[PDB]
């Protein structure tokens, strides 16, 4: 499993830009892909999504109608065509898998992504940035606009772990089940619209920025994301 | 006005009386047996669709009896229903929507008849091929521009009908409604002398030609092949264009003797009085077909008795 | 209702239908035929031969014949109950039976290998399952009876057997033999054929009989037959 | 080879005949106790409400 | 030789007095003392569609939702019960499978058939496609049955009339059951998973253990080949059925029969037997194009389970009871409630 994107650079406005993934190592057809985007100390957002054998493609109003991704499975190539650059688009696109079945893990793997320079539920996280030395116990608490618990009788919720100089890592989806290679010292719990991450005991490699994400609807939107510094 | 429609307008079919005529009862049979026809789309369309796989020979017997529910549905009730229901219409409207529906149905009848028996007669003398390329995709295909060639040839008659307004229907056949010509007489004659024989060739005379030249030549490659056909193929072969023709002939040969009669008045009561008979025999076509397109396939046939008893003995 | 998560799993489902209704598609174009015979009846050649044209358990032979596929399906090598399992079988287009026509006179540790091999035949035949499939018999070892029935009578064999010493006799009344046990002749067919040194011929037999099946079988499914 | 055969057999059969065995009527007994504890939560015997029951009309 | 046949027969003759005085009473007798159990309903909720050839085997999860089949087009389906959603479609090499297992924790399935080889399959790979994990050779028969008794070590039954216990991270047989004289047909796994009973056609059970690896017992009665085998969810018996078209349950504490069930009407053989979460009611899928219920305690009709359009091949209730599902030949597994 690795993700490598082509693509960017210094552009300017009326300039278009063709960027490009290659997947490879996994079944591309039957995993789709999103594209996320952070801008220079900024929270994350989501762009795009096409699902298996493009049958459904989806846009977010930020970005509806400008932007046109593309997928090509024989290929196995992911393409996203920006026509139009805004002073405000510039910012670090990630493509992430995500496969929809009963127990999965969708968005866990997150590519390298790649620098491009331009020349809906509410989520917000109570705390920003919590200093604690490595060996307490740590809690972060979110709280969305929207309750997420659907009727089906689970909630909605990931959360994403960056690390400097890495792409967010999955920690736990559906606030229920850890993901497949995290410590087990991750656990994540909520009720409705208030949600809390805790952790038994931090660690050096715990040091980056936990982003929340709800996953109700179709406009995902992210918190600004809680950082931890020894 | 065209002389056809100047006599019909003073056509000689009302009385008054305490006593119900014969026609009241003629219609209320016509009723039933559309009612039949229904209950049996109804029941062959629900099993097929959710209790039996789609293959070519369940996706033509779906189509068929889509298009007979149809038929059995647009033509008595739903026109009784706004009979009465006198909406923000005009009568010319609903007598051209039934001429329409009525047209559809029998190309798309005439057509999936057709094309059932050259896929039989594929089946019987190129198996290999067939078995290799025969799917449903191409079924569905073929079925999509049949029923585009139904409409694009009922669409001359869509555009040809001047009728004014249950039991006294009248739904007229007149091309003087739009696109008129030099003449109003021959222009007439002419147009609708062409639309009998269109519609003759595309319902009667070509479905039924290839159905029996598809089953010569089954018969034929059995006979050559060394094969012995048993009673029943000739009994289904028998059934299948005998009900045929006692549904359909009769309808063209009135039609053709009308647009024989537009110089002859001598004959125009005849057809005043036998196109009712006629239609109501063309409609038992969509009771005919069902029975023997059903019923005569055994896994339809089985899976169809043991709903229906299981059905019938749940609810008890 | 559906949240985004039920409809992507919903189309994930309306694609894994559609891909494996087109794999059913495709898998019925190939027929299924079943080989049956006695290890020494010369299926060996016939599957070599038919393969140079083109461990344990049972063995898939693929091979295409004039634009049509077909599927032999060895279970020799199962020395298991073959009531348990042969239902499985019920689908199976043919079954090309092989016998040893000219071991008449050898022993088996039936006593004989004819006496077992009529037995077989008819209990496939017989079969509750194999009641409107179509069997195949072919004679791989013509060429050796007719080496041996010149020094070794066939009364061996055949007692009751009183008619000519000649080849073409004995072979007639091995193939009436044969024939005789079908008890369901109303509803199936037996297309009996000798085998020789040629290939070929035994190939062609082998469409013909399953296009002959393929077309009973399209006409029983229309509701024709 | 039949030696072997039947001396595997009689071991087998010497084998069996010396574990232990208890009544009909106590296993029985211990059958319908069992049945009886767990039928209050046995949905096939006393179906659930709708309320609880997942299966119902998609 | 005649020394140890008559040896042998004084034993068999020593067990059968043993097993007829420890006969103090039947099980209709004490079971005549409560009333009987009401009319059953059980009304089909889902009608899972998408096969194309006749089912053989299924089996449910732990999570009592996801229940996978095999069919002898050779693609193995995992059926979600609440969605009828498609999982995953795992396509066989060999399209002959008749057994298929699906283990604890779900994360990996076990099948097998005609190809005399066991294929594992492991359906939480880091790649994202299922890909066969591990293929256990060596048996000379069918694969008939086959169950997971931990997610390194499983068990599976093979036509050869032996089974053999075969490691996963290994890959080779440790453990060798043989005494079977017919092809064995179905196995059943305890809830201790300490030992299992198993049957063949020789119309007989036997009773093995995992670690010790010998017939702990062995028990009769049947006139044809055990075709089902289930145990009990208390796990101190278990039921079998065969083609005598009647179902036998055992106890493996009395060595011998406590009830029959049969009925004039049915002739047919049986195809699967399974138990409820309590043990009630039991559940018997007939060649008659549906499946009949019986009284554990009574052998009286509870209801039947009608609405397959062929032989009724598979049945299993889920963990929690809630529902059953049924798969037979007409590629069709509906879900009753
Ligand atoms: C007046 C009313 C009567 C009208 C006549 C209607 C008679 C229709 C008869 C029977 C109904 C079922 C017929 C199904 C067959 C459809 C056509 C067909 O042949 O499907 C072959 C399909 O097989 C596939 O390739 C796999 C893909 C699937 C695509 C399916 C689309 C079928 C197009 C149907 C269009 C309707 C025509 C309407 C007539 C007015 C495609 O045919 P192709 O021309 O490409 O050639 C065949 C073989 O001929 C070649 O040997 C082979 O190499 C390969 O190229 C290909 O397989």
Redesign the pocket.
């Given at each position: 499993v690795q993700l490598v994107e082509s693509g960017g650079g210094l552009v300017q406005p009326g300039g278009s830009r063709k960027l490009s993934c290659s997947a490879s190592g996994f079944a591309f057809s039957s995993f789709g892909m999103h594209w996320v985007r952070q801008a220079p100390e900024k929270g994350l957002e989501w762009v795009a999504y096409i699902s298996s054998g493009s049958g459904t493609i989806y846009y977010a109003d930020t970005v509806k109608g400008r932007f046109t991704i593309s997928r090509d499975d024989p290929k196995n190539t992911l393409f996203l065509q920006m026509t139009s650059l805004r002073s405000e688009d510039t910012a670090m696109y990630y493509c992430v898998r995500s496969i929809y079945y009963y127990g999965s893990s969708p968005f866990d793997f997150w590519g390298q992504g790649t620098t491009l320079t331009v020349s809906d539920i509410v989520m917000t996280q109570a705390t920003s940035s919590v200093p604690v030395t490595p060996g307490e116990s740590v809690s972060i608490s979110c709280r969305s606009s929207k309750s997420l618990l659907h009727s089906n009788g689970n909630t909605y919720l990931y959360w994403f772990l960056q690390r400097p100089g890495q792409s967010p890592q999955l920690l736990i989806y559906r606030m229920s089940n850890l993901a497949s290679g995290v410590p087990d010292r991750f656990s994540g719990s909520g009720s409705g619209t208030a949600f809390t991450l805790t952790i038994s005991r931090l660690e050096a490699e715990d040091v980056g920025v936990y982003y929340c994400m709800q996953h109700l609807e179709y406009p995902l939107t992210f918190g600004a994301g809680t950082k931890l510094e020894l | 006005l065209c002389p056809i429609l100047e006599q019909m307008s003073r056509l000689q079919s009302h009385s008054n009386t305490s006593i119900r005529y014969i026609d009241h009862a003629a219609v209320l049979l016509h009723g039933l047996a559309s009612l039949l026809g229904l209950v049996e789309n109804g029941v062959i369309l629900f099993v097929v669709g959710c209790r039996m796989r789609q293959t070519?020979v369940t996706t033509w017997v779906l189509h068929l009896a889509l298009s007979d529910l149809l038929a059995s549905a647009s033509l008595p009730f739903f026109t009784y229903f706004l009979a009465v229901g006198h909406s923000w219409e005009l009568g010319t409207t609903f007598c051209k929507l039934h001429s329409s529906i009525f047209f559809l149905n029998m190309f798309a009848s005439?057509?999936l008849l057709?094309?059932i028996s050259?896929?039989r007669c594929?089946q019987v003398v190129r198996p290999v091929?067939?078995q290799?390329?025969?799917?449903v995709?191409?079924?569905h295909?073929?079925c999509l521009?049949?029923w585009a060639?139904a409409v694009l040839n009922t669409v001359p008659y869509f555009v040809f009908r001047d009728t004014i307004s249950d039991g006294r229907i009248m739904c007229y056949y007149n091309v003087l409604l739009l696109n008129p010509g030099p003449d109003r007489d021959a222009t007439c004659n002419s147009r609708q002398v062409a639309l009998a024989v269109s519609k003759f060739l595309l319902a009667f005379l070509?479905?039924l030609a290839?159905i029996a030249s598809s089953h010569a030549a089954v018969s034929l490659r059995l006979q050559h092949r060394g094969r012995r056909r048993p009673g029943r193929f000739v009994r289904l072969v028998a059934a299948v264009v005998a009900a045929f023709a006692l549904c359909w002939g009769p309808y063209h040969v009135f039609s053709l003797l009308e647009a024989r009669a537009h110089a002859n008045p001598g004959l125009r009561p005849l057809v005043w009085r036998g196109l009712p008979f006629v239609t109501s025999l063309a409609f038992f076509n969509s009771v005919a077909n069902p029975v023997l397109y059903v019923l005569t396939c055994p896994d339809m046939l089985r899976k169809l008795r043991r709903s229906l008893r299981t059905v019938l003995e749940s609810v008890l | 209702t559906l949240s985004a998560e039920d409809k992507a799993a919903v189309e994930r489902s309306k694609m894994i239908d559609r891909n494996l209704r087109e794999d059913g598609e495709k898998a019925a174009r190939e027929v299924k035929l079943l080989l049956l015979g006695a290890g020494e009846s010369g299926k060996n050649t016939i599957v070599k031969q038919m393969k140079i044209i083109h461990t344990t358990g049972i063995v898939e032979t693929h091979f295409t014949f004039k634009?049509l596929h077909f599927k032999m399906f060895d279970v020799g090598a199962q020395r298991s109950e073959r009531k348990k399992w042969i239902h499985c079988f019920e689908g199976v287009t043919a079954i090309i039976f092989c016998v040893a026509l000219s071991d008449y006179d050898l022993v088996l540790a039936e006593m004989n290998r004819m006496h077992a091999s009529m037995k077989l035949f008819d209990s496939i035949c017989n079969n509750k399952w194999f009641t409107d499939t179509s069997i195949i018999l072919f004679l791989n070892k013509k060429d050796l009876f007719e080496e041996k029935i010149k020094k070794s009578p066939l009364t061996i064999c055949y007692p009751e057997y009183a008619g000519s010493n000649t080849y073409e006799e004995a072979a007639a009344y091995i193939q009436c033999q044969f024939e005789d046990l079908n008890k369901r002749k109303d509803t199936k067919e037996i297309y009996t054929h000798f085998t020789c040194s040629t290939d070929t011929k035994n190939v062609q037999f082998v469409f013909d009989a399953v296009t002959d099946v393929i077309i009973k079988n399209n006409l029983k499914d229309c509701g024709l037959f | 080879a039949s030696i072997a055969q039947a001396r595997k057999l009689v071991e087998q059969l010497k084998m069996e005949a010396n574990i232990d065995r208890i009544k009909v009527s106590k296993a029985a007994a211990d059958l319908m106790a069992y049945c009886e504890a767990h039928a209050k939560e046995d949905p096939l015997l006393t179906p659930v409400p709708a309320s609880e029951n997942p299966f119902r009309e998609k | 030789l005649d020394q140890l046949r008559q040896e042998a027969e004084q034993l068999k003759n020593q067990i059968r007095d043993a097993r007829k005085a420890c006969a103090d009473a039947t099980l209709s007798q004490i079971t005549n003392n409560i009333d009987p159990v009401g009319r059953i309903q059980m009304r089909t909720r889902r009608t899972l569609r998408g096969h194309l050839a006749k089912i053989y085997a299924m089996h449910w999860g732990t999570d009592s939702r996801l229940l996978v089949s095999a069919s002898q087009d050779g693609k193995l389906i995992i059926w979600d019960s609440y969605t009828t959603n498609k999982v995953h479609a795992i396509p066989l090499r060999s399209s002959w499978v008749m057994t298929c297992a699906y283990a604890p924790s779900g994360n990996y399935v076990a099948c097998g058939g005609l190809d005399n080889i066991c294929s594992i399959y492991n359906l939480k790979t880091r790649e994202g496609n299922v890909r066969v994990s591990r293929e256990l050779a060596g048996h000379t028969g069918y694969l008939s049955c086959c169950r997971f008794l931990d997610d390194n070590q499983i068990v599976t039954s093979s036509g050869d009339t032996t089974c053999a216990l075969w490691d996963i991270e290994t890959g080779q047989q440790t453990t060798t059951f043989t005494g079977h004289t017919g092809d064995v047909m179905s196995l059943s796994l305890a809830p201790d998973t300490r030992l299992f009973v198993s049957g063949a056609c020789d119309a007989s059970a036997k009773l093995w253990d995992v670690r010790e690896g010998m017939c702990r017992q062995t028990f009769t009665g049947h006139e044809s080949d055990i075709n089902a085998i289930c145990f009990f969810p208390n796990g101190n018996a278990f039921a079998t059925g065969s083609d005598d078209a009647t179902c036998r349950l055992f106890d493996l504490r009395a060595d011998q029969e406590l009830m029959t069930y049969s009925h004039d009407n049915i002739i047919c053989g049986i195809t699967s037997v399974s138990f409820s979460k309590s043990g009630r009611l039991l559940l018997a899928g007939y060649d008659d194009f549906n499946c009949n219920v019986w009284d554990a305690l009574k052998a009286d009709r509870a209801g039947v389970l009608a609405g397959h359009d062929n032989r009724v091949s598979c049945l299993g209730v889920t963990d929690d009871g809630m529902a059953v599902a049924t798969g037979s030949w007409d590629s069709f597994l509906k879900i009753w409630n």
């Open positions: - | 070519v005439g057509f057709s094309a050259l896929d594929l091929w067939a290799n390329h025969r799917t995709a191409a079924a295909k073929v521009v049949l060639l070509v479905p290839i | 634009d | - | -």
